Amino acid sequence: SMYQLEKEPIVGAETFYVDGAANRETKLGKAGYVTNRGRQKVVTLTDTTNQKTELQAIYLALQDSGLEVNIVTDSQYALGIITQWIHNWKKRGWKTPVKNVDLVNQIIEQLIKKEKVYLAWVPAHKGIGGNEQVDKLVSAGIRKV
Ligand SMILES: CCOC(=O)c1ccc([N+](=O)[O-])s1
Ligand SMILES: [Mn+2]
Numbered sequence: 001s002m003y004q005l006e007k008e009p010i011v012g013a014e015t016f017y018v019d020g021a022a023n024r025e026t027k028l029g030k031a032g033y034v035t036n037r038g039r040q041k042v043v044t045l046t047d048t049t050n051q052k053t054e055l056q057a058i059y060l061a062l063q064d065s066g067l068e069v070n071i072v073t074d075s076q077y078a079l080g081i082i083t084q085w086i087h088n089w090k091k092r093g094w095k096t097p098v099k100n101v102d103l104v105n106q107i108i109e110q111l112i113k114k115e116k117v118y119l120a121w122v123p124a125h126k127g128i129g130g131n132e133q134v135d136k137l138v139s140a141g142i143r144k145v
């Protein structure tokens, strides 16, 4: 394709644990990351959805990272929509998604500027690790954990 994500993590590269949370009643949310080299960022968002905050967190990781990046998301949708866009691009019977088109397009913009990207899904879980840390940061004031 016009790109292909890595099949396994990029050894040596900084890892961004991304997450977003939104509250449906208010459309308020947060998106951000923590990294294994001690970086972290959280942004507040309005007029948003959980899916958009998860994509926004990936966007921030691509914006703030170097040429090779590992990204761990707990959003099956964010992973799928991005992967399908990559694999199905400038190809035959693919039709652009309806929702979140602008944001996914901006993510794709960032992605083609990278040299290597590993994007993996994990389920949300308990513990003290990376997904847990960023979840708590974006959930504060948005949802009870
Ligand atoms: C308040 C939301 O806290 C979160 O970060 C997430 C919860 C569940 C996710 N998942 O199942 O795609 S992310
Ligand atoms: Mn999440």
Ligand SMILES: [Mn+2]
Binding pocket: 019, 020, 074, 124, 131, 135
């Ligand atoms: Mn989470």
Ligand SMILES: [Zn+2]
Binding pocket: 046, 047
């Ligand atoms: Zn608003």
Ligand SMILES: [Zn+2]
Binding pocket: 067, 068, 115
């Ligand atoms: Zn490189």
